[PDB]
Amino acid sequence: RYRPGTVALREIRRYQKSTELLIRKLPFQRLVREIAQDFKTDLRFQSSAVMALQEASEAYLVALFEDTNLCAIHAKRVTIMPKDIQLARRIRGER
Amino acid sequence: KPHRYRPGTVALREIRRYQKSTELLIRKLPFQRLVREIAQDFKTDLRFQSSAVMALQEASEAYLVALFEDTNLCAIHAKRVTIMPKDIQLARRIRGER
Amino acid sequence: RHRKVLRDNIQGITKPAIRRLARRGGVKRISGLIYEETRGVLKVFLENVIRDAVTYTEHAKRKTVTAMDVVYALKRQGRTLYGFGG
Amino acid sequence: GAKRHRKVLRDNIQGITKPAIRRLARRGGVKRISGLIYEETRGVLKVFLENVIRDAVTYTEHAKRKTVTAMDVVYALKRQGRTLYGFG
Amino acid sequence: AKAKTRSSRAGLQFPVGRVHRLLRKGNYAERVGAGAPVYLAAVLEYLTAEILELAGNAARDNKKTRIIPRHLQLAVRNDEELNKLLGRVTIAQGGVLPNIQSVLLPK
Amino acid sequence: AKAKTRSSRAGLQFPVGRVHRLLRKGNYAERVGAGAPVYLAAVLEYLTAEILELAGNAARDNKKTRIIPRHLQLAVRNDEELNKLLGRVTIAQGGVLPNIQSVLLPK
Amino acid sequence: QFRESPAYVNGQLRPYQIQGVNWLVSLHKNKIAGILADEMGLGKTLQTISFLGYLRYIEKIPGPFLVIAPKSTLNNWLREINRWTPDVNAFILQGDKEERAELIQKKLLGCDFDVVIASYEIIIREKSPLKKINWEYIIIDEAHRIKNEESMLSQVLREFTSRNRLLITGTPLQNNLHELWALLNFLLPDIFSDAQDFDDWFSSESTEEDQDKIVKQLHTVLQPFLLRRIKSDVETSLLPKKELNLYVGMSSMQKKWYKKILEKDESKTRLLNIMMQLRKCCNHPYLFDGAEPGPPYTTDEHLVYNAAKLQVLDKLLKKLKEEGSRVLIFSQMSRLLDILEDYCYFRNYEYCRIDGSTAHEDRIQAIDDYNAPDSKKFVFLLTTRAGGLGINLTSADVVVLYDSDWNPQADLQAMDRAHRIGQKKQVKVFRLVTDNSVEEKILERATQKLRLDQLVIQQNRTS
Amino acid sequence: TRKESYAIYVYKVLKQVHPDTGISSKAMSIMNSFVNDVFERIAGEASRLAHYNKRSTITSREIQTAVRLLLPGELAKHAVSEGTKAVTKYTSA
Amino acid sequence: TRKESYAIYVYKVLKQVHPDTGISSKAMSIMNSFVNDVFERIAGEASRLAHYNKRSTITSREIQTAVRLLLPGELAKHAVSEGTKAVTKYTSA
DNA sequence: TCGAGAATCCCGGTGCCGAGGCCGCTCAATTGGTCGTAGACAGCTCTAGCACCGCTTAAACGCACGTACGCGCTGTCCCCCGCGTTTTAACCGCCAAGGGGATTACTCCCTAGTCTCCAGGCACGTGTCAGATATATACATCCGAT
DNA sequence: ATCGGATGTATATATCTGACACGTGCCTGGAGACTAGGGAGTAATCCCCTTGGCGGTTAAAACGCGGGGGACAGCGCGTACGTGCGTTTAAGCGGTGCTAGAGCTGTCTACGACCAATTGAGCGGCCTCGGCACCGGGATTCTCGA
Ligand SMILES: Nc1ncnc2c1ncn2[C@@H]1O[C@H](COP(=O)(O)OP(=O)(O)O)[C@@H](O)[C@H]1O
Ligand code: BEF
Ligand SMILES: [Mg+2]
């Protein structure tokens, strides 16, 4: 087998190496159409607009998790927990 | 039979007193010497007005008060009630200013 | 013609997808209570960007939200996105 | 007598004295301070005043003047995001 | 005839002529349409009416009948909408809200 | 008379007439001095030359010949001064710097 | 009047002061104020004090009687009140914020006093419990602080209420003739009370044709309204004075500093004033904070090497030790005394310094120990605005004005300080002027401001 | 050379809102800088709105879109209702 | 409809710097948006520089001050030196 | 458990000093003719988006197991706060000076604008070649018995 | 703490595959040459505003000694998450076909730019007074021993 704490670092190297998109296309696109149909009904999306929203959302969540990891290593742990994210958005000025 | 307060009451009463009022917590002339010192490295022999030195003082108090609020949030997060240098270094790392 | 809203699609940001987005960001070990919070954060961000994009699109009389509208919403909020135009 | 030689330049960032930093931290919310905040606070304050005075000196060297007015510090703070109301 | 100001036509309290001149001579656009200065004077009136109503009430609850910048700092940082608008903005001679976290109160 | 383009008088690679059109037909000011677009085109050339030089080295470090935005992401983010300039920019098809924290390494 | 030398005072009078008293007994008799502006040295205090008991023993109002003097000269008043008229109570309103409430509330306000002796700068901070009493006189002394039109002290002294205001001062006008009406406005508001109607009231003293009739239409209103007497008329010291100039040359070290002020080449200081930094460098070099070499502290006999005047000063001083004399050293900058204090502590010399902000009770003890017979402190370091305004130094003769001030009569206020009644030696004044430097043109400027008053007005004041 | 501000206009709006409560001069300077700030933000957003659509002219319609893009949440409804009512009241005369 | 980009200009600079390097299409779009972004930053700072001093004309001098304000660190000295060399060579011809 | 005692909230009197209100200019905001062209409206090509079908397979879901770590407790230890005397240096008010900001007028010359040639840039086919990608082999690297 | 070994990626190589660099046409913005003129440089005048330092208050920084309370290292211990196995279902792919809307254009027309005469709202400068800042003396309450 492997010790608990090995496949984590192998996946970190595999994912900080490559450049693909990490959310499936059609669930994210149906999420976008759901949130869009409360502001104007019957909208249409160019495919590059859905790609742009997916790229902006992935960049937002990845930077958020870097800063949450910094807070959790500050609090003498190795594990993120929801008060770390709520701290990391209280400091940044987005709450 | 003296009369000493505890180690946690004079700080609280100062907190309410200083959140209630709006003076300048930094003195004038040490800050004016500071600003003239830092200005005579970039262009030599400038003259200031007085209200511009007031402006630099007001912005410096705003930035330091916001900095100590965010440091105190990280400190109460870390199961302490004290601030420390690692907390200020963290709360400047998080904002994107380093 | 027709229109429907289906399945309460915030459950499309699934558990291995959030774990891949955390393994990229440097996190080793994830709790089990993050997942509702991550879904809530992502929903707030998409409401803001799509609110501004639909504002621009209803202004310029179109309906097809082109990529320039989303890029200008992101430029408005303070996150530039190179790579798509303008 | 040896009294004249101690007037020296003092590294004037020590003008921001210890009770001044404690009054800022008492207003801000901190109940109890450590004893190594002080070097770090003077470091942070010197970084912030370097950046704002650098933009003020550039705006003043532009219009050929030699008098850094208050409008230049208001424009230098507006430059960086931290807007300042009350001066013009 | 005799002059009749456009501020009096629109029923406003802001100098619509001055807004029209600052929109031509700022180079914000090549040609300013006539509908825009009236609209912009109205929006500026409404924002000033909001901040002055809130400032007046927060000043009057402290038994002082002139508005000083402390009252503006209270009347902005209390309400969530104007807090969301005035995010970065520092107000001089302003002071910080009463804001103490919960664990520093004594046992 | 014939022609002698300003991109050959200044000795540049980026154009001049297009930047002069985008200063006088974009309403950045009323009158545009004739010296300004040469200076502006030279500065845009300098920044483009820096990022393409660093990107060429970072692409040669993985032994390919065509620069792709993974390489621009690494070439912008490793150098500190360009990282100060572009601190907010999200580059599509981005990639991240490989950074592992200090305590997560095994004991 | 008064040909009997009235000895209700417990002391003497003088055959010219008796004539001075008759000018004082007539002004209250005619209900107008005055300016007792005699040339300094002839005892305006005794003419003031004998005026007081005249109104106590003849007109018989005990009165509250406010006087105001500068900080150093306060101890000189309460001696000579009690040396001459010991039947009059008095104060020396001093102390902390504590020690004035017992004086005012408990010991002044219950009518338990005669005469208050306050200072210039306590009369601002305690004006609110001092407006209640109607006074008899506000006997301001050394009245040159009232030369501004909207200063703080001139603004408070139009709210006090009294009968008269003896503005008993030392000198007339200093720079303009915008000055002397502001002295005359706060005397008596019934004469002018008008600013714009004074400037051309006499045609402004010769900004048109230099007529010498312009000064005549002045002096038919204020020659019998002011008193001023010639020195050699009275034989004040039984001896004249001799001003001497001693041109010195600059050292090369301060010349390297000098061309870093004009051409502007320890270094990189605030050189934002030109006329004030050059007043430092052509007096003593070490004022630029770092010209002292070597260890963090250490003297060395070299101190007279770098400085251009210390070889000139100490050779002049070691002349004077061989003659058996005592000197008075003045200055304008306070920090230059810090070098001379360490100087005579290095080359074995005893001293007393009266700087600004020594203390109050410390200025008292130094003066008595310096005026004692067989008290052998050789030098006595002073400053201009703190010390040279009315202390009594009859037990020293020779003066070395180390620098010239922009006011020509500031040093003239201070030259004649020791040179008063009681000085029996030969007063020798020495001025140290740095040749081919900046300080001559501040001496050339000072000559013209003095020749306007000493040669035009004094020839028309004796007339 | 005159410094011109919006002092009397803020003062008239204060007299219409409250009956008596006067204002102090430092707060007048703050309200001056605030109104100049909001004017620069709204003019900038309507400016490059009219630039993105390859137009050349600020209408009322671009000001309405810029008010929906700067004022957050529920100042937007009241501001756009006030704008429409003031322009329509202006239209008849 | 033709569109104004900057593919061929970046491509010339690339063939100067590294003589045997190709460049893919998304990288060309990124360099297009990069040059447009830096253009809009410098023109914006120069525009409100020349409006703050109550003047009315963007010279080269406000461009130099805009570059000394925006570009950080050791990019300012190289950028100002490149610009002064270009304009000084331009005046002689 | 239930007292004594300092910090803080009110209260009436003062006195003070910055706001409210007029006076007298003055430049810019209304009105009224005139053009000149950006913009709306009807009208078409044409193309990219939506809906939908089946087919393959790799990724999500759920479950069971083992254990590394989160958390409470608990004793130690050193250190930061409170208190009270000291020295000292900031603060407000002189006191001179002059460099420098702000007008004001005069002239000078660099840019806007015009029409007229004319080639650099953009779009559209086409050769061609760096790279995706599967197969086989090989090198590093965690993990366990002695 | 160290070899056997078991399993991860890494890489050399071979075959297609689109994506890129390059060849040719079309033409619309860019150079250019003369003109018309209003903004901006430049010299002179002048006059408010800054600067350095000193003088006398007096509130605040500094030092030292003592003391209780928070930081923190270790110890136990209970649980929540990583790792693995199998099953399923939904994403991806490819391909078809329909069609709603977007982009370009041709042609009027009402809408703002420009100028020219004019007069009043707005702004600098000067009185005058109500809000208020002390200002010290009283009353209420919270803190800390018992
Ligand atoms: N009648 C007198 N007898 C003795 N000494 C006198 C007499 N009158 C004046 N003095 C001397 O005058 C000096 C004080 O004079 P002062 O008032 O300082 O003169 P001024 O007012 O000109 O400075 C004292 O030293 C005192 O000895
Ligand atoms: F003022 Be006297 F000369 F003591
Ligand atoms: Mg005297």
Collapsed DSSP state (helix, strand, coil) of residue G319: helix
Q: Which nucleotide is nearest to B9 (CA to C1')?
A: K143
Residue H81 in tokens: 């209702």
- What CATH number matches the domain at G17-234, 3.40.50.1860, 3.40.47.10, 3.40.50.10810, 3.90.1150.10? 3.40.50.10810
Contact G113, G37 (CB under 8 A): no
Tell me the one-letter amino acid at E103.
V
Contact E28, H47 (CB under 8 A): yes
Contact G286, G342 (CB under 8 A): no
Residue E45 in tokens: 């009136």
Contact E70, E95 (CB under 8 A): yes
- Supply the DSSP symbol for G103: I
Instruction: List chain E residues with CB under 8 Å of H58.
Output: 23, 28-29, 31-33, 36
G167: nearest Cα among G148, G182, G152: G182
Q: Which atom of ligand 2 is nearest to the CA of G416?
A: 3
| CA-to-CA separations, E47 to E41, G340, G378, H72, in angstroms, rounded | 10, 67, 77, 12
- For tokens 């349409």, the residue is E33
Domains and CATH numbers, chain D: 1-88 (1.10.20.10)
Q: Straight-line distance from CA A5 to C1' J143, in Å?
A: 13
DSSP secondary structure, G169-196, as one string: -S----S-SSHHHHHHHTT-TTT---SH
Residues spanned by CATH 3.40.50.10810 within chain G? 17-234
Instruction: Give Cβ neighbours of residue G452 (< 8 Å, ≥ 6 apart).
Output: none
Q: With residue G272 as reference, give the H or E element that holds it.
A: none
Instruction: Give Cβ neighbours of residue D51 (< 8 Å, ≥ 6 apart).
Output: D80
Provide the strand spans (E) within H1-93. Answer: 57-58
Q: Of how many residues is chain H composed?
A: 93
CB contact under 8 A, F53 and I17: yes
User: Dihedral through CA F27, CA F29, CA F32, CA F37, nearest 10?
Assistant: -70
Q: What are phi and psi of G401, to 5 degrees?
A: -65, 105
Count the Cβ atoms, other than its own, within 10 Å of residue F102. Answer: 6
- Supply the DSSP symbol for H74: T
For residues I7 and G21, give the distance between their C-alpha atoms in angstroms, rounded to a whole number: 104
Contact G292, D5 (CB under 8 A): yes
Burial G433-456 (b: 16+ CB within 10 A, else e): bbeebbbbebbeebeebeeebeeb
**Structural domain boundaries, residue A39:** 1-95
- Supply the DSSP symbol for G359: -
Instruction: Give Cβ neighbours of residue E81 (< 8 Å, ≥ 6 apart).
Output: H72, H73, H74, H75
For residues G385 and G120, give the distance between their C-alpha atoms in angstroms, rounded to a whole number: 13
CATH fold of G242-455: Rossmann fold (3.40.50)
Instruction: Name the residue of G46, G74, G229 whose CB sits within 8 Å of the most ligand 1 atoms, as the mutation to test its pocket.
Output: G46
- CA angle (F16, F21, F26) in 5-degree steps: 135
For residues I17 and I21, give the distance between their C-alpha atoms in angstroms, rounded to a whole number: 9
Provide the strand spans (E) within G104-145. Answer: 116-119, 138-140
- Residue by residue, what is the 3-state secondary structure of E31-85? EECCHHHHHHHHHHHHHHHHHHHHHHHHHHCCCCCCECHHHHHHHHHCCHHHHHH
Instruction: List chain G residues with CB under 8 Å of B45.
Output: 264, 270-272
Q: Calculate how far, in angstroms, residue B56's C-alpha sits from the geometric centre of ligand 2.
A: 48
Residue-range domain boundaries for chain H: 1-93
Radius of gyration of chain E measured on its C-alpha atoms: 20
F39: nearest Cα among B3, I79, D24: I79
CATH fold of E1-107: Histone, subunit A (1.10.20)
The structure's method of determination equals cryo-EM
- For tokens 């060297």, the residue is D61
**Cα(first)–Cα(last) distance of chain H, in Å?**
36
Contact A92, A67 (CB under 8 A): yes
Tell me the one-letter amino acid at G391.
I
CATH number of the domain enclosing A8: 1.10.20.10
Collapsed DSSP state (helix, strand, coil) of residue F5: coil
Question: Does C28 contact chain H (CB < 8 Å)?
Answer: no
Contact E44, H13 (CB under 8 A): no
Collapsed DSSP state (helix, strand, coil) of residue G18: helix
Please, which contacts does D55-60 make with residues 24 or more away whose CB atoms are closer than 8 Å?
D55/D79, D55/D80, D55/I69, D56/B52, D57/B39, D57/B42, D57/B43, D57/B46, D58/I65, D58/I68, D58/I69, D59/I49, D59/I52, D60/B43, D60/B46
Contact C21, C41 (CB under 8 A): no
Q: What are phi and psi of C8, to 5 degrees?
A: 55, 70
DSSP secondary structure, chain A, as one string: ---TTSHHHHHHHHHHH-----S-HHHHHHHHHHHHTTTSSS-EE-HHHHHHHHHHHHHHHHHHHHHHHHHHHHTT-SEE-HHHHHHHHHHHT--
For residues G130 and G151, give the distance between their C-alpha atoms in angstroms, rounded to a whole number: 20
For residues B68 and D25, give the distance between their C-alpha atoms in angstroms, rounded to a whole number: 6
Contact G288, G266 (CB under 8 A): yes
For residues H60 and F78, give the distance between their C-alpha atoms in angstroms, rounded to a whole number: 47
E39: nearest Cα among A14, H39, G290: H39
Contact G342, D2 (CB under 8 A): yes
Contact G71, G142 (CB under 8 A): no
Q: With residue F92 as reference, give the H or E element that holds it.
A: none
Total domains in chain B come to 1
For residues E50 and G272, give the distance between their C-alpha atoms in angstroms, rounded to a whole number: 48
Residues spanned by CATH 3.40.50.300 within chain G? 242-455
F50: nearest Cα among F66, F23, F28, F72: F72
D12 touches strand K (CB under 7 A): no
Contact G41, G416 (CB under 8 A): yes
I24 touches strand K (CB under 7 A): yes
For residues A67 and A78, give the distance between their C-alpha atoms in angstroms, rounded to a whole number: 13
For residues F97 and F75, give the distance between their C-alpha atoms in angstroms, rounded to a whole number: 10
Instruction: Give Cβ neighbours of residue E99 (< 8 Å, ≥ 6 apart).
Output: B19, B69, D29
| CA-to-CA separations, D25 to B11, F99, G330, G345, in angstroms, rounded | 11, 34, 49, 47
Tell me the one-letter amino acid at I61.
R
- Supply the DSSP symbol for B82: B
- Residue by residue, what is the 3-state secondary structure of G48-94? HHHHHHHHHHCCCCCCCCEEEECCCCHHHHHHHHHHHCCCCCCCCCC
- Pure H helices in C1-86: 15-24, 34-59, 67-77
Q: Which CATH class for the I1-93 domain?
A: mainly alpha
Q: Calculate how far, in angstroms, residue G431's C-alpha sits from the geometric centre of ligand 1.
A: 27
For residues I36 and I41, give the distance between their C-alpha atoms in angstroms, rounded to a whole number: 9
Q: What are phi and psi of E80, to 5 degrees?
A: -80, -30
Beta bridge partners of G248: G434
Residue G102 in tokens: 């017992």
Q: Calculate how far, in angstroms, residue G41's C-alpha sits from the geometric centre of ligand 1.
A: 7
For residues I40 and E100, give the distance between their C-alpha atoms in angstroms, rounded to a whole number: 44
Beta bridge partners of G431: G245, G401
* Positive or negative: CA dihedral A22, A24, A29, A32: negative
Resolution of the deposited coordinates, in angstroms? 3.9
For residues I82 and F32, give the distance between their C-alpha atoms in angstroms, rounded to a whole number: 21
I60: nearest Cα among I34, I39, I81, I87: I87
For residues E75 and E55, give the distance between their C-alpha atoms in angstroms, rounded to a whole number: 5
G352: nearest Cα among G330, G382, G392: G382
C20 touches strand K (CB under 7 A): no
For residues G378 and G384, give the distance between their C-alpha atoms in angstroms, rounded to a whole number: 19
Residue nearest to atom 1 of ligand 2 (CA): G390
CB contact under 8 A, H68 and C76: no
Instruction: List chain C residues with CB under 8 Å of F91.
Output: 82-83
Contact G245, G411 (CB under 8 A): no
Count the Cβ atoms, other than its own, within 10 Å of residue G62. Answer: 14
- For tokens 């000063």, the residue is G313
Q: Of how many residues is chain I composed?
A: 93
Q: Which chains touch H (3 or more CB pairs under 8 A)?
A: C, D, E
Crossing angle, helix D18-28 and helix B10-20, to 10 degrees?
Answer: 80
- Pure H helices in chain F: 6-9, 17-24, 36-60, 69-78, 80-85
* Positive or negative: CA dihedral G113, G119, G122, G124: positive
Q: Which nucleotide is nearest to B13 (CA to C1')?
A: J7
User: Dihedral through CA G77, CA G78, CA G83, CA G87, nearest 10?
Assistant: 120
For residues I66 and G27, give the distance between their C-alpha atoms in angstroms, rounded to a whole number: 74
Instruction: Give Cβ neighbours of residue G417 (< 8 Å, ≥ 6 apart).
Output: G328, G388, G390, G391, G393, G399
